[PDB]
Design brief:
This is Neutrophil cytosol factor 4. It is found in: Cytoplasm, Cytosol; Endosome membrane; Membrane. It comes from Homo sapiens. This protein has 56 residues and is an all-beta fold. It has one domain: SH3 type barrels, CATH 2.30.30.40. The protein has no helices and five strands. Strand 3 and strand 4 form a beta hairpin.
Length: 56
């Protein structure tokens, strides 16, 4: 599925997915209850579920 970012998320590590509010993320899977793995802006990485709205 996909998720629309609600807030900007600037990760510290290259393992974390960077994005800005309004970006639509192509989800890859849940890594745990509070985090997702997804793709956007040419990169892949993990990010907090609470920073996006799942489009479903």
């Amino acid at each position: 599925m996909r998720a629309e970012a609600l807030f900007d998320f600037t990760g510290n590590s290259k393992l974390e997915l960077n994005f800005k509010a309004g970006d639509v993320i192509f989800l890859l899977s849940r890594i745990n209850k509070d985090w997702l793995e997804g793709t956007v802006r040419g990169a892949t990485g993990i990010f907090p579920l609470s920073f996006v709205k799942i489009l479903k």
